[PDB]
Coordinates of C-alpha atoms in Angstrom, one line a residue:
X1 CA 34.0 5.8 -42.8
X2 CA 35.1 6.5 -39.4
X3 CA 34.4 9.5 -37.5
X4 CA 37.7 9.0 -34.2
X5 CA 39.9 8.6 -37.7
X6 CA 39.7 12.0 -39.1
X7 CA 40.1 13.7 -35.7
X8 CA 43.5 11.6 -34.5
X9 CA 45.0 12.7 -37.7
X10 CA 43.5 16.3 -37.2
X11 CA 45.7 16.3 -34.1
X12 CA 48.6 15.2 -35.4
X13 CA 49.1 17.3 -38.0
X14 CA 48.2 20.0 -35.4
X15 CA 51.3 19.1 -33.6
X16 CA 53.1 18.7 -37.4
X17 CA 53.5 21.7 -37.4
X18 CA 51.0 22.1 -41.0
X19 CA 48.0 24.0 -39.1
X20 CA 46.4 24.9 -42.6
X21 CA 45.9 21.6 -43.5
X22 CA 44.8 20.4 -40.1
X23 CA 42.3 23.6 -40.0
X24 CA 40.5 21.5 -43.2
X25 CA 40.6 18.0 -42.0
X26 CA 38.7 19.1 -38.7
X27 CA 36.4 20.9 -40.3
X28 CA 35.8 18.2 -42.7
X29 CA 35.6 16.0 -39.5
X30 CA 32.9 17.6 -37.8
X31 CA 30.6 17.4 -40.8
X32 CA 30.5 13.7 -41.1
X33 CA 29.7 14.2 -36.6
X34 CA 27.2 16.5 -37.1
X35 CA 25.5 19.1 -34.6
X36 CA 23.8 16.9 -32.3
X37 CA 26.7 14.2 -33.1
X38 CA 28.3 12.0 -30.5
X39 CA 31.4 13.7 -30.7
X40 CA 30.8 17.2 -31.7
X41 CA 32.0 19.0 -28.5
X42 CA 35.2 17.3 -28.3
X43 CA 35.9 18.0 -32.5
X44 CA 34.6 21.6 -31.7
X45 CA 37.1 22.2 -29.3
X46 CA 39.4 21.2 -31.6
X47 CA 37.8 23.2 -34.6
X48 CA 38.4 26.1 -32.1
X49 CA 42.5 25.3 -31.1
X50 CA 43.5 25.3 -34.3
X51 CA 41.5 28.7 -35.3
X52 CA 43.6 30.0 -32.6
X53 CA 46.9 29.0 -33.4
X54 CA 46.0 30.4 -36.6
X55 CA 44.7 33.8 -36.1
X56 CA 41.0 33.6 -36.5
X57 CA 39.6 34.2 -33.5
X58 CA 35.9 35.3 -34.2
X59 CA 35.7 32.1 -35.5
X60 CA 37.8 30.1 -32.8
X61 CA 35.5 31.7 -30.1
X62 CA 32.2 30.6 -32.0
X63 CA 33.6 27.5 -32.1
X64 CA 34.5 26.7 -28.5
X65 CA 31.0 28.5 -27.8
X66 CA 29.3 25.8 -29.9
X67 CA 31.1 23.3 -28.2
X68 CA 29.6 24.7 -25.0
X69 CA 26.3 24.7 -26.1
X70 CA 25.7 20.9 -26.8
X71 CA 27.4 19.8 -23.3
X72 CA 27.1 23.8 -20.8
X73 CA 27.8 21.4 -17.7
X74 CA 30.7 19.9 -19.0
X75 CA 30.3 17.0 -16.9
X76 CA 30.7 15.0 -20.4
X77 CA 33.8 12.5 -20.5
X78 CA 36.5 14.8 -22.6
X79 CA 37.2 12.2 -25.3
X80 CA 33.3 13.5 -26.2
X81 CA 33.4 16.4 -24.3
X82 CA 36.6 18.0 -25.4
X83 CA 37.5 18.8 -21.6
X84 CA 37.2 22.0 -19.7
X85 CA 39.5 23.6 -21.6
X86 CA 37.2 25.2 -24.3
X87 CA 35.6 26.7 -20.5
X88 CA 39.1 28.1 -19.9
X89 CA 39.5 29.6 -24.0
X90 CA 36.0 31.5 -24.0
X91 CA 37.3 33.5 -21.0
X92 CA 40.9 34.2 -22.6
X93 CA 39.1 35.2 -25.9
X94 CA 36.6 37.4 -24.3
X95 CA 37.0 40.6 -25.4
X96 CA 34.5 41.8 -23.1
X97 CA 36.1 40.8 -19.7
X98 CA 34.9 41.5 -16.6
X99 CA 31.8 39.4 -15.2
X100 CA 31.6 37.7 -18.4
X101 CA 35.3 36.4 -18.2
X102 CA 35.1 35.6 -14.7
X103 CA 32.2 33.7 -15.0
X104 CA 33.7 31.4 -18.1
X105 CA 36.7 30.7 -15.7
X106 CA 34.7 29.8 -12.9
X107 CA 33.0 26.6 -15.1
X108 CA 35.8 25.6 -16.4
X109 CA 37.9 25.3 -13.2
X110 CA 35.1 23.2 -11.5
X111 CA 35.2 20.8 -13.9
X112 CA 39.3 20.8 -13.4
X113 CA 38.4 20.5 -9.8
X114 CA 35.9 17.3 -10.9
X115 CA 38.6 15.3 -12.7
X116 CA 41.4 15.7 -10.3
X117 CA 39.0 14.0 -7.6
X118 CA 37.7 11.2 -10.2
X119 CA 41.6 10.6 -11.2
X120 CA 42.9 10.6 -7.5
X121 CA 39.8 7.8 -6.9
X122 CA 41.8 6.1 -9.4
X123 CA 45.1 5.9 -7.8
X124 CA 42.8 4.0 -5.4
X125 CA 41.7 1.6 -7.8
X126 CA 45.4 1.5 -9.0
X127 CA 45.0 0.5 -12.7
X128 CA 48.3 -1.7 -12.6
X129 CA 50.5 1.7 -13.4
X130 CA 50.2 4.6 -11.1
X131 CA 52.6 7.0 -12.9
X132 CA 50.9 8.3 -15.9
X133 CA 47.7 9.4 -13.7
X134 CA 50.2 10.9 -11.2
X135 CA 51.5 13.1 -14.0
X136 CA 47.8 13.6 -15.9
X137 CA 47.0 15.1 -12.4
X138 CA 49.8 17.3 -11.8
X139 CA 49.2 18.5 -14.8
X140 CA 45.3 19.3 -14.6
X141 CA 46.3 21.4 -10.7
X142 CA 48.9 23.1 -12.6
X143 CA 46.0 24.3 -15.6
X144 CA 43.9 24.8 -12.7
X145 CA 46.3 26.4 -10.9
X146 CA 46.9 28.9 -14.1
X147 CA 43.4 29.7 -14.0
X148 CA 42.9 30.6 -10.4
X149 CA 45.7 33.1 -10.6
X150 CA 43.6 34.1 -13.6
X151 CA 41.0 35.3 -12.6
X152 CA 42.6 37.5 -9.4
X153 CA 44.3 39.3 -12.3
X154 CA 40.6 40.0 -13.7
X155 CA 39.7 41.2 -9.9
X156 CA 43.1 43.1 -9.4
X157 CA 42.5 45.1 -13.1
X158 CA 38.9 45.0 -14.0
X159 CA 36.6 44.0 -11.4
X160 CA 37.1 46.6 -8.3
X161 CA 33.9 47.3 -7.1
X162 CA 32.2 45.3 -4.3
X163 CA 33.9 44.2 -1.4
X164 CA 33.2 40.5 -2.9
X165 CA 36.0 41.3 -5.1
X166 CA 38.7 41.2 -1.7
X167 CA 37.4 37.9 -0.2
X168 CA 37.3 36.4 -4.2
X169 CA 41.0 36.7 -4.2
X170 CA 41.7 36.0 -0.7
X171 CA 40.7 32.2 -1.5
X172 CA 41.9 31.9 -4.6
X173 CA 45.3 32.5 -3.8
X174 CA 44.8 29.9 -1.0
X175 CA 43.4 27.2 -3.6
X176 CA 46.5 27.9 -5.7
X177 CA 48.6 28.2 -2.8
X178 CA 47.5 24.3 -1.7
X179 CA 47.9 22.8 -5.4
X180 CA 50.9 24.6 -6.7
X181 CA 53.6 25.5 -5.0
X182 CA 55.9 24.9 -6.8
X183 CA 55.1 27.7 -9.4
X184 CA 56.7 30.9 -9.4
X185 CA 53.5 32.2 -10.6
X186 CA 51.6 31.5 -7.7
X187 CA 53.2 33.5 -5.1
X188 CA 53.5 36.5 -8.1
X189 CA 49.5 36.4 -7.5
X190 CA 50.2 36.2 -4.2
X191 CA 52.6 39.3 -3.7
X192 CA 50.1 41.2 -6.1
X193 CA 47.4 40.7 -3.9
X194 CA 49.2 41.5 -1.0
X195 CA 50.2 44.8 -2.5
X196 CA 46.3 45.7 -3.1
X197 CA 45.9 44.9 0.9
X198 CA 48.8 47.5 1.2
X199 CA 50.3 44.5 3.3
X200 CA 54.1 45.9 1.9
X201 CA 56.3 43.7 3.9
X202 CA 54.0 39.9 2.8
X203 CA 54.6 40.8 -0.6
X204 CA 58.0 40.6 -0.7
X205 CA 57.9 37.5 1.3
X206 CA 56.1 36.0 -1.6
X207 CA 58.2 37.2 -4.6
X208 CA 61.3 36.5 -2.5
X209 CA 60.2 32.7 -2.2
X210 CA 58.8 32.5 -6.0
X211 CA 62.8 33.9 -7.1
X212 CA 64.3 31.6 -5.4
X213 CA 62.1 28.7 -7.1
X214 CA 63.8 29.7 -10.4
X215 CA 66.6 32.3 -9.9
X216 CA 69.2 29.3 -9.6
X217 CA 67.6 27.2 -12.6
X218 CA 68.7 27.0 -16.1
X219 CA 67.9 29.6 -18.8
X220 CA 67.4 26.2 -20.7
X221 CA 65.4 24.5 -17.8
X222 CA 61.9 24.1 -18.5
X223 CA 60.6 26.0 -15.2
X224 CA 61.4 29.4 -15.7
X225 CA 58.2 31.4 -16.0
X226 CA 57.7 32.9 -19.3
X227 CA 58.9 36.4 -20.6
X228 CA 55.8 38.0 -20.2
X229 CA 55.6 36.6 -16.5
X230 CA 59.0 37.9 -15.5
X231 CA 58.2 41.6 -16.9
X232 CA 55.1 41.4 -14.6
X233 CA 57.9 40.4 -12.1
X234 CA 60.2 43.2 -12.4
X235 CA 56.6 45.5 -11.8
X236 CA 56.2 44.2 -9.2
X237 CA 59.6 44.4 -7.3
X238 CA 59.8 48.2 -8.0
X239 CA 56.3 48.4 -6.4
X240 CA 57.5 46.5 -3.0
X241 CA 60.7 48.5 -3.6
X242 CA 62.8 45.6 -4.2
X243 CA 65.3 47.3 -7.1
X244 CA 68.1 44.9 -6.1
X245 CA 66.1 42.0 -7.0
X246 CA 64.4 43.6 -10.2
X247 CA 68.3 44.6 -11.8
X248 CA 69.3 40.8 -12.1
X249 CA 65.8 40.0 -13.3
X250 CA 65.8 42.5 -16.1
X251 CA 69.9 41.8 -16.8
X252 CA 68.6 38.2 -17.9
X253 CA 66.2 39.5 -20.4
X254 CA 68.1 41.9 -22.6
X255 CA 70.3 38.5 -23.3
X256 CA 67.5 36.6 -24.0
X257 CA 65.9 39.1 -26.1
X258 CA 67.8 42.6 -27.5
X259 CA 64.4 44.0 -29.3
X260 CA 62.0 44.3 -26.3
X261 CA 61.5 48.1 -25.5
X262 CA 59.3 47.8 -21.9
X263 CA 61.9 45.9 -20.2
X264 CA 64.9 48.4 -21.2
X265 CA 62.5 50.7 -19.6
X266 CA 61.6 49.0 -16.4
X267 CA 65.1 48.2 -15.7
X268 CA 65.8 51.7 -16.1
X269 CA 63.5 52.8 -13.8
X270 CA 64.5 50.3 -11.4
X271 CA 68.1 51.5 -11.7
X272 CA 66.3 55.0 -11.2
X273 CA 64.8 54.6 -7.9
X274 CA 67.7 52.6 -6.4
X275 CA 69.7 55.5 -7.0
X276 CA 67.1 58.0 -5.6
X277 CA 67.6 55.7 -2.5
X278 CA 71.5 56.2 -2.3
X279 CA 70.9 59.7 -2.5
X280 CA 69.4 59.8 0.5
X281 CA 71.9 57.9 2.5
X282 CA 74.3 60.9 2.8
X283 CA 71.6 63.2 2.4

């Protein structure tokens, strides 16, 4: 008999770990909300994050496009709305790519970009704690932040036709440059993008400066970019023929994983061309 019940339980056992269960109370949820409901976008989105952690995700993408459809601007306040985020999740599920991913990122990034200005007018009002809005915000650039280097990966692989695709990425790295740089990430997209401009010596200004933001951290410290980040590294450091840099990069991820087979590979080839360059110093 009350329909913010069902879904604050639905999210705690999301985060209990027991995703089978929380996959039925959700969908339960959303029946008592209905279509046109007050809530539905925001129990949708849900409906649609815990399809994903499962492994459906025809239904996880109808989902999230559902929860578009009632609320497309997404101007709706998130505890109804369910946030940009579902924005964000029908442009990582597209299987289709291209235009049609780019386009999905694009919606829900302005709507990042709307709530970081509404929350930094309420540092203004000061609502007798300014820390947790500090954090909520620095969190919201960062998911921004992930989703403008996002979409340059789309125009670096995919999208290469028109000229608009140079200028896209041009300011998106300068967006991402102004509210995250702190991330490692960030001036990864940055050296990529360099490298398409054939502008050899700025990339490795950029990977240089997003090593040393981690390569001193803790394995265990929580800002290391992920293992599928640092393999996209070590790519890219062979490209700007930075070997050196790649063999310490690679040396860390046999020892944090002994079954992946691309970076054996990599770190190989690395070792590879760093010889072929010795070669040539005598001739």
């Amino acid at each position: 008999i009350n329909p913010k019940e069902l879904l604050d339980r639905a999210t705690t056992l999301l985060e209990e770990g027991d995703i089978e269960t929380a996959a039925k109370v959700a969908r339960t949820a959303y029946e008592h909300i209905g279509e046109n409901g007050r809530h539905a976008g925001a129990a949708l989105t849900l409906l649609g994050q815990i399809h994903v952690e499962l492994g459906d995700i025809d239904a996880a993408r109808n989902y999230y496009a559902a929860a578009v459809k009632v609320d497309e601007d997404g101007s709706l306040p998130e505890e109804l709305g369910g946030g940009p985020e579902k924005f964000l999740w029908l442009a990582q599920l597209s299987e289709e790519g291209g235009h049609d991913s780019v386009a999905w990122f694009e919606r829900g990034a302005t709507v990042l970009r709307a709530q970081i200005q509404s929350l930094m007018d309420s540092l203004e009002q000061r609502p007798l704690s300014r820390g947790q809005v500090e954090a909520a915000i620095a969190d919201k650039r960062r998911r921004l932040a992930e989703t403008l280097c996002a979409v340059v990966e789309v125009y670096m692989t995919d999208l290469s036709w028109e000229d608009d695709a140079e200028q896209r990425c041009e300011a998106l790295i300068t967006e991402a440059t102004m509210i995250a740089p702190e991330w490692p990430e960030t001036w990864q997209t940055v050296a990529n993008v360099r490298i398409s401009q054939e502008r050899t010596e700025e990339a490795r200004e950029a990977l240089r400066r997003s090593l040393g933001l981690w390569t001193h951290l803790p394995p265990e410290d929580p800002g290391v970019p992920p293992f599928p980040s640092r393999v996209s590294l070590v790519r890219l450091l062979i490209e700007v023929d930075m070997e050196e840099e790649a063999l310490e990069v690679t040396e860390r991820l046999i020892a944090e994983d002994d079954l992946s087979v691309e970076v054996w590979y990599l770190g190989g080839y690395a070792r590879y061309r760093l010889g072929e360059k010795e070669r040539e110093a005598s001739g």
